[PDB]
Design a protein around this ligand. Sequence first.
Ligand SMILES: COc1ccc(/C=C2\S/C(=N\c3cccc(F)c3)NC2=O)cc1O
Length: 328
Amino acid sequence: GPVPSRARVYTDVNTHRPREYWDYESHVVEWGNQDDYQLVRKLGRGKYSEVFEAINITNNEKVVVKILKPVKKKKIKREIKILENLRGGPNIITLADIVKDPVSRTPALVFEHVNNTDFKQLYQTLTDYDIRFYMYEILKALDYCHSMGIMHRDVKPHNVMIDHEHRKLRLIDWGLAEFYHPGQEYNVRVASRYFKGPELLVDYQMYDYSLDMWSLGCMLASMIFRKEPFFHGHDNYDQLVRIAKVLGTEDLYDYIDKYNIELDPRFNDILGRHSRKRWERFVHSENQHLVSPEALDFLDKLLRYDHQSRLTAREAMEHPYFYTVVKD
Ligand SMILES: COc1ccc(/C=C2\S/C(=N\c3cccc(F)c3)NC2=O)cc1O
């Protein structure tokens, strides 16, 4: 069978936490007052929820209300428990309340509000310095949640809220996040297609926090190279082919051979043979102001097939790419 794997950091965090910390199925929700919140406008809809701007009438402050569609109560408790565990951490969205919506007959999560700019327009305006600054702020959030025993599993631009006026960043949408337990096998149907790590694309279930670092590398590559998304697959099979055309097929085979994994035979006629490319080939006159040797080295150390070889969040924060970022 497949070779097992463990996280190289924060491996035992949940082992030595009290069971109440990670045993989300036993969590007892503390419900707030549903009439404290007045919905103002709908902001979005997903497969699992709708999100609204709202006003908390007990303080006349804007909040954001996520009304869940019906889903396994286990998954609802998981997201609530994770949000409560991480509340107050650096750049983690703050869950302010949980209420029962009388119309949907489901829980409604109430969050702090972020006056954000959509990434489609924000990414066209960010400077080299802005990108380093906000990448550092995302790493603070990821090192925190990893240090707290949690993997996010849906890192992508749409889940990073940025109020550019106040240089404020929040990592949102913890609905796919999970507790890391050594040796646990996880669902590989997580993350958005363009941000799925090779471990998900080869169906390796014993993955860990390092999945988030692949997704972050995909974000970085799209920003410094001005190509969004960077790995633009048309389905989950073509997604791995897009990656292999950059990282090469020999190291893909080294990866699956190390964990004694077999590729889906449907790759026999689509994968081809590809050399590993140098990142300089993606540099051109319209993105070179966002590229430096430090940026390419940092990106190279995030985008590794082997989840065990990627920078950890803490290691990433030590990288020379962040030397120019003003520290507080
Ligand atoms: C503008 O300010 C904020 C915006 C969002 C959030 C928190 C969210 S949105 C979410 N899921 C979605 C995403 C898209 C569509 C959908 F129907 C649900 N999960 C969270 O935690 C907090 C804010 O302050």
